Amino acid sequence: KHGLTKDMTMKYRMEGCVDGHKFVITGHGNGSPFEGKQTINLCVVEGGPLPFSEDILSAVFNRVFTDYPQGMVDFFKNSCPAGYTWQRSLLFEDGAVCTASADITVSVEENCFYHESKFHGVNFPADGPVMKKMTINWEPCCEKIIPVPRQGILKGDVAMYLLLKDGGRYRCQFDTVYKAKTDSKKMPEWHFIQHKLTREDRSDAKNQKWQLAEHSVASRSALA
Amino acid sequence: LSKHGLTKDMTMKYRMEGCVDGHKFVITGHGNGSPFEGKQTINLCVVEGGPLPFSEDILSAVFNRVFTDYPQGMVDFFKNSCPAGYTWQRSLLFEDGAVCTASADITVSVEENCFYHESKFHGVNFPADGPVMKKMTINWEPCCEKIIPVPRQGILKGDVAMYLLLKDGGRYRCQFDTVYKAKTDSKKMPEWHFIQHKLTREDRSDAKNQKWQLAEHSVASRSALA
Amino acid sequence: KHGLTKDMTMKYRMEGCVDGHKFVITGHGNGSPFEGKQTINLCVVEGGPLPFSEDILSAVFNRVFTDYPQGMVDFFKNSCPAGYTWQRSLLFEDGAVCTASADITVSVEENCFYHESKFHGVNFPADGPVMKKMTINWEPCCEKIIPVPRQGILKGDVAMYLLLKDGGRYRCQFDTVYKAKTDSKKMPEWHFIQHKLTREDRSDAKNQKWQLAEHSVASRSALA
Amino acid sequence: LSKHGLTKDMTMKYRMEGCVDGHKFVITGHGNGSPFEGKQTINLCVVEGGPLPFSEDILSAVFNRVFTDYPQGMVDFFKNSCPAGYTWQRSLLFEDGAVCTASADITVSVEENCFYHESKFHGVNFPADGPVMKKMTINWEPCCEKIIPVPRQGILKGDVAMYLLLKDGGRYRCQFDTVYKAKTDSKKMPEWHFIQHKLTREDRSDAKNQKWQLAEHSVASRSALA
């Protein structure tokens, strides 16, 4: 129901700019919304190769792909098929700052998600891990999701870590606001979503490209 | 297995010396709990400087990760450090610019089956019109703290964005960053993990003293994703 | 010299997005680079009226307009006529985050500045002063300017305040990186720039528009 | 005009109690300066807990805005509070996540022509490999602090992004946020303004004690733009 089926496809377009370097990424995906599982295949269409680590972009590419237990309000599935939008700041530990946003829609006819995104990054230091391309993946995490009932929005809060080639970690604070396109009659209570997001490089002579895989699962506090 | 010097049911004694915006105070107390269950109850009294002009909830998380239920198969850094115990240091950055520093030293007296917990707390710049100075805070919301090993140094770091829930139904955010150190060298270090916590306060003050009870339940876990 | 004259003109284009609301601003200006004085006339061409305070945008519209004392290296005038670029994060006290960047060029032939800018803002609270349009002006300030000699860039650091209708103030941290297009042989030592920037609303039935005026003056520490 | 209880040339005495990552210490000292010139020299000795395992520069700005040259025509909040004096509270957020809180109480003994300065300092989470624990800091760079009145409450707030300059020619940032309170009610409040500061340290330690001299020159100003 909700324009959703067990197995679905996705189409992506991101327009971005990081320290003045413009780029465009397009892509396609498949996954299973009720399992909170997705696979995403991206290609740098303009501005490639990227002079910064592509890992900074990965979490911009849809909380409809979350496994919500029975009994928990699913704000994101409830927003479908019209969809939902989000806005996020990324505050990195070395003073780099990004802003990101996206618009998610379901084409029922087509059993497809259309995802349009924007990304703006400033002040990545020249010899930092993003510009030296020393990143490998984000570490799995636990995001806290908070309702703001008076406004019909959710906020998310997670302290993320990007794992580095030498074994270190590079921290980034994510702060997100999530809004349905049509204000739903039901709001969840606060909860967690755990996430694991991985990148596999698929780049060839012609184009820079890669595959992301995500698994996300919502839960309540484990303490009675 | 006995080597930690711990038992199923134990007691604790507390002393805290603090200062929040120039107001000096001393808190003492006693507790009981079950360290392998990650459960404790703590009874505190303001023995100098009472009544406090700021919300006592800013203090609550100062009062012992030996009281965490660690699943088998995870390395328990804290109980591994017993009975000598461990120390920690924490920054608290509140959303309205207030800042606190806190530190503590935990030791086990095996003969008394009792923890000795000594702490220090300094806070600055709580706005006169905010929830701490207006005593509008009711409880910390239950949370999920990330714990990260620093194998180079044999310490752990913890990171958690905490929220105090307010009388009016609002929420007030505070970022905790903590460094956890054993008093002697862990042969073993954990992988990164989570600790979920739930910490509650019930006021027990009367005409003689400002007093309150805390209760904590804390449980460690790994990522739920394969 | 440097493609500069005492009296010059400017042309502006900004493409922006703040909490998903797209907009385009164009404009024209006149001022005097050596006096650090400029007047800027802006019009919201797409996306108007703006649903957020326009004051958040004002400091995106050129450090060529700084009065540098004799004896102090002028990184910005030295970059002319090719120009300079900059990237900035704006961290507001209520969790709102913006990223901004711009590209400045001098048309010598035309005695004109071409200024192209981008602005992305997320997470302005609905009942905050930006969305309630409770702002009047930025308070004059003192920015610290620091050289990074190994890289040929400058960083700037200023804690800004937006004055509110009720008499309050709303703080925003500015962190900027400034880069010449052609790496200059000379770098300044650290210094201050003081700035005063004002807005006058010029809006009519057809379009939202306003005028900015800036005066900026560089100095060294006043302590021997 | 005499009402402040100050004179052209005055002395000071200091005591600081502190703790940085569990290392306790006490510093005492003496000073001389000229409060209307905004100039002072301060001589400090580590009397308990020495030698310090962290850079003493993290402490320097703990040691009195009565020592500011205010131009005529500006309201001098600090000298207006004399001779009773004033108090302050400050957060120090360093760029590598270390956090300090500091507070002090300044009083004038008019009979001794001497300031009594009592302070407290708590710091946490300096990385073992950073410049503070490696003693790589040489001096704070001269700065420009914004001072803002809060007329509702009769306090001032100050805001300054400070940088410690390192042996290697690098720089290490620290955000200072301070609240300044007079001990009794200012009939008068300043408009917002700037204070430019220059604070220097020269080590004077020997085989017996860790000791150093600070010197400060601080001058208030208004915006330079019409």
Asked if C126 lies within 8 A of A20 by C-beta distance, the reply is no
Asked if C159 lies within 8 A of D146 by C-beta distance, the reply is yes
What is the CA angle A222-B3-B5, rounded to 5? 75
- C-alpha–C-alpha distance, residues C43 and C27, integer Å: 6
Nearest residue of A to residue B147 by CA position?
A141
**Would you say the C-alpha torsion B167, B171, B177, B181 has a positive or negative sign?**
positive
Q: Can you state the percent helix, strand and coil of chain B, rounding each to 5?
A: 10, 55, 40
On the CB side of D18, CA atoms within 13 Å amount to 32
- C-alpha–C-alpha distance, residues B122 and B188, integer Å: 33
| Nearest-CB residue to B225 (from A157, A169, A196) | A196
| Nearest-CB residue to B100 (from D101, D103, D128) | D101
Chains that touch C (3 or more CB pairs under 8 A): A, D
| Nearest-CB residue to B91 (from D89, D103, D124) | D124
Chain C hits for D219, Cβ within 8 Å: 222-223
Q: Choose from C37, C142, C153, C193 for mutation: most chain D CBs within 10 A.
A: C142
Q: Choose from C150, C171, C196, C223 for mutation: most chain D CBs within 10 A.
A: C223
Which residues partner with A176 through β-bridges? A88, A156
How far the first Cα of chain C sits from its last, in Å, is 32
Token pair belonging to D15: 């005591």
Asked if A146 lies within 8 A of B159 by C-beta distance, the reply is no
Q: Print the SS3 string covering chain C.
A: CCCCCCCEEEEEEEEEEECCEEEEEEEEEEEEHHHCEEEEEEEEEECCCCCCCHHHHHHHCCCCCCECCCCCCCHHHHHCCCCEEEEEEEEECCCCEEEEEEEEEEECCCCEEEEEEEEEEECCCCCCCCCCCCEEEECCEEEEEEEEHHHCEEEEEEEEEEEECCCCEEEEEEEEEEEECCCCCCCCCCEEEEEEEEEEECCCCCCCEEEEEEEEEEECCCCC
How far is C-alpha B8 from the chain's CA centre? 20
- C-alpha–C-alpha distance, residues B77 and B67, integer Å: 12
**Check: CATH 2.40.155.10 for D1-226?**
yes
Closest-CA residue to C196 (of C34, C36, C25, C26): C36
Grouping H, G, I as helix, E, B as strand and the rest as coil, residue B80 is: helix
Token pair belonging to A81: 């098929």
Question: Residue D202: is it exposed, middle or buried by C-beta count within 10 angstroms (0-12/13-18/19+)?
Answer: exposed
- For chain A, the DSSP string reads -TT--SSEEEEEEEEEEETTEEEEEEEEEEEEGGGTEEEEEEEEEESPSPSS-GGGGGGG--TTS-BPPTTS--HHHHHTTT-EEEEEEEEETTS-EEEEEEEEEEETTTTEEEEEEEEEEE---TTSTTTTT-EEEEPPEEEEEEEEGGGTEEEEEEEEEEEETTS-EEEEEEEEEEEESS--S--PPSEEEEEEEEEEE---SS--EEEEEEEEEEE--S--
Q: How many CB atoms lie within 10 A of CB D8?
A: 9
Q: Are C64 and C38 in contact (CB under 8 A)?
A: no
- For B92-159, the DSSP string reads EEETTS-EEEEEEEEEEETTTTEEEEEEEEEEE---TTSTTTTT-EEEEPPEEEEEEEETTTTEEEEE
- For B37-50, the DSSP string reads GTEEEEEEEEEESP
| Phi (first) and psi of residue C75, to 5 degrees | -55, -35
Asked if B146 lies within 8 A of A159 by C-beta distance, the reply is yes
Grouping H, G, I as helix, E, B as strand and the rest as coil, residue D207 is: coil
Q: Are B171 and B94 in contact (CB under 8 A)?
A: no
Shortest Cα–Cα distance, B185 to chain D (Å): 16
Element of type H or E holding B79: helix B77-80
* Fold designation for C1-224: Green Fluorescent Protein (2.40.155)
- C-alpha–C-alpha distance, residues A197 and A194, integer Å: 10
Grouping H, G, I as helix, E, B as strand and the rest as coil, residue D163 is: strand
Distances (CA, A) of D14 to B193, B223, C125, D43, D116: 46, 52, 46, 9, 6
Q: In chain A, what are the domain boundaries?
A: 1-224
| Nearest-CB residue to B224 (from A146, A194, A223) | A194
Distances (CA, A) of C100 to A158, C17, C97, D66: 24, 11, 10, 41
Asked if C146 lies within 8 A of D171 by C-beta distance, the reply is yes
- For A105-143, the DSSP string reads EEETTTTEEEEEEEEEEE---TTSTTTTT-EEEEPPEEE
Q: Are A145 and A195 in contact (CB under 8 A)?
A: no
Question: Residue D24: is it exposed, middle or buried by C-beta count within 10 angstroms (0-12/13-18/19+)?
Answer: exposed
Q: Are A36 and A65 in contact (CB under 8 A)?
A: yes
Chain A hits for B143, Cβ within 8 Å: 144
Grouping H, G, I as helix, E, B as strand and the rest as coil, residue D47 is: strand
Token pair belonging to A122: 């400033």
Token pair belonging to A102: 């996206």
Cα dihedral A60, A62, A68, A73, rounded to 10, equals 110
Nearest residue of C to residue D160 by CA position?
C159
Q: How many CB atoms lie within 10 A of CB C49?
A: 10
- C-alpha–C-alpha distance, residues A54 and C170, integer Å: 35
Nearest residue of A to residue C87 by CA position?
A122
Closest-CA residue to B41 (of B222, B197, B216): B216
Distances (CA, A) of B225 to A150, A194, B24: 33, 8, 47
Token pair belonging to B20: 């929040």
Chain A hits for C128, Cβ within 8 Å: none
- C-alpha–C-alpha distance, residues C42 and D106, integer Å: 51
Asked if A123 lies within 8 A of C151 by C-beta distance, the reply is no
Closest-CA residue to B97 (of D16, C173, D186): C173
Asked if D223 lies within 8 A of C196 by C-beta distance, the reply is yes
- C-alpha–C-alpha distance, residues A132 and D146, integer Å: 37
- What does this entry list as its resolution, in Å? 1.8
- C-alpha–C-alpha distance, residues B210 and B135, integer Å: 14
| Nearest-CB residue to D196 (from C141, C217, C222) | C222
Token pair belonging to D72: 């005529």
Question: Residue C46: is it exposed, middle or buried by C-beta count within 10 angstroms (0-12/13-18/19+)?
Answer: exposed
Experimental method: X-ray
Chain C hits for A87, Cβ within 8 Å: 19-20, 122-123
Asked if D225 lies within 8 A of C192 by C-beta distance, the reply is no
What is the CA angle C82-C88-C89, rounded to 5? 170
Q: Give Dmax (Cα) for chain D.
A: 55
Closest-CA residue to A18 (of A101, A131, A94, A103): A131
At position A17, the amino acid (one-letter code) is C
What is the CA angle D54-B177-B216, rounded to 5? 125
Shortest Cα–Cα distance, B105 to chain D (Å): 9
Q: Are B34 and B9 in contact (CB under 8 A)?
A: yes
Q: Are D58 and D123 in contact (CB under 8 A)?
A: yes
Token pair belonging to B118: 């000594």
| Nearest-CB residue to D177 (from B100, B120, B125) | B125
Q: Are A153 and A48 in contact (CB under 8 A)?
A: no
At position C39, the amino acid (one-letter code) is T
**Would you say the C-alpha torsion D46, D49, D50, D54 has a positive or negative sign?**
negative
How far is C-alpha A66 from the chain's CA centre? 11
User: After which residues is the backbone of chain B broken at C–N > 2.5 Å?
Assistant: 63
- C-alpha–C-alpha distance, residues B149 and A135, integer Å: 19
Shortest Cα–Cα distance, B198 to chain A (Å): 7
